[PDB]
Amino acid sequence: WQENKSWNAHFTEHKSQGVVVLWNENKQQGFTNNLKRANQAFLPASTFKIPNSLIALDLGVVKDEHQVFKWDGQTRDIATWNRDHNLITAMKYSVVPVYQEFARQIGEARMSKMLHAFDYGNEDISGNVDSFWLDGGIRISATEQISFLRKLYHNKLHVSERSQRIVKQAMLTEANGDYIIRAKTGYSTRIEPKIGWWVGWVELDDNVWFFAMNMDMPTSDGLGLRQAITKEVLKQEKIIP
Amino acid sequence: WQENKSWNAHFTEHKSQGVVVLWNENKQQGFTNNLKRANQAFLPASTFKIPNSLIALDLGVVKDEHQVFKWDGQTRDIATWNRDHNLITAMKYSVVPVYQEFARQIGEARMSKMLHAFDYGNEDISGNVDSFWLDGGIRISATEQISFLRKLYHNKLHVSERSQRIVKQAMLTEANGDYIIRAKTGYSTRIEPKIGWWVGWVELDDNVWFFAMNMDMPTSDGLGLRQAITKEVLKQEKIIP
């Protein structure tokens, strides 16, 4: 992991603090504005929807990306959560209660064994079965998210090829004639420090660039900056126009 | 299929003639500006890359979307063809010689069986094994394109589920927070009348709209009108913003 402090310009500019980590798959070389924070492990929060999805599909808790998970009737503070969802929309709107129920169905023994198979962060599921990635013992760094995502990208995780392809579909965030981004956002707020994440990758015609970023996120006002700052860095490195 | 001739203004203002066909999946209802032309069958040209891809994957002629098809060294008139490709970039840049190599390896017997299984247009593969879809006997209408694409969407074609998912990934054209388009363009130029195609679908949170369009295309300077006219229709119908 090579250090490039000049990306801090983009954080300073927006009165923010964080790290971006990039990984050039073809050259097998990684870059970050801050080596220490790149390796600092945090609660994954909604970024956990990646592994949680893989596990739920592999075990048949989720049958496919069209199966409907009916709203439980409880109205919650994000409006999009109060309605029926499938896997695609549950990821898009980051619908926690839908993933809490997958987690209960998975159960702590299958969950722990899967997270060891995935080498996922510290591999510790201490806490409630349905919230450990929000306020429990699990921790992962920006560099460990990249390691994990690379395996997903190559269908190398110990779940079916099919589960992996479905999750990569459900990760689709943006695409045009220049690139494809598959990614997941997250916002850790239950346990200090409040931080925002975006992890995933950019597919080009002849390379892929993995990314993982996190940043201080005192309130939800600055969440747009997860993507905006990442993209500023991608632009600076000529990955996207 | 209900006729909506008001879409004609979008062809007219572009000095063009053609058909857009739309199918609302939830409601099981179709719409077109021109019922006759909707049903008129033409050579599929490069839109044939959809079934051809499925067949190549299902038979193992293509191992996966990463397999590299090396440039054969012959300089062709579309510059993006004169380089190595994989399935994703062969579709994106519509690299005919790569697909002609597939057709040759598939062979006429399996090709014909497959197209019968797909109910692909007139199911007639008469002509050269390596170009029947460009100057042979196969013909398919816009509405037949929709029928085929609905199967692919639901994984109901007689090829593996894996093949269908890989082809739907390769069709990815555009994605954002409003919609995902999976589609394939074509331009039939070898046999009159010269026509351009765009076929695929738009995925929304809660519905999918299939589309197939073709239009007269005397020269390559009107090619961007395939997408432009289609999108003006989609926007008039409030399917996309």
Ligand SMILES: *C(=O)N1C[C@H](NOS(=O)(=O)O)CC[C@H]1C(=O)NO[C@H]1CCNC1
């Ligand atoms: C994930 O980290 N979640 C769920 C939502 N994810 O959105 S995000 O991917 O854009 O970051 C929102 C943040 C976080 C979460 O759980 N927030 O808490 C909920 C509980 C009530 N307030 C919202």
Ligand SMILES: *C(=O)N1C[C@H](NOS(=O)(=O)O)CC[C@H]1C(=O)NO[C@H]1CCNC1
């Ligand atoms: C498909 O119909 N093809 C291949 C290319 N497709 O691009 S497009 O999908 O945007 O329509 C180009 C058009 C067409 C084709 O075969 N054209 O002819 C070839 C031979 C010489 N000119 C290129």
Ligand SMILES: [Cl-]
């Ligand atoms: Cl996809």
Ligand SMILES: [Co+2]
């Ligand atoms: Co900047």
Ligand SMILES: [Co+2]
């Ligand atoms: Co371990």
Ligand SMILES: [Co+2]
């Ligand atoms: Co340990």
Ligand SMILES: [Co+2]
């Ligand atoms: Co352990």
Ligand SMILES: [Co+2]
């Ligand atoms: Co289905």
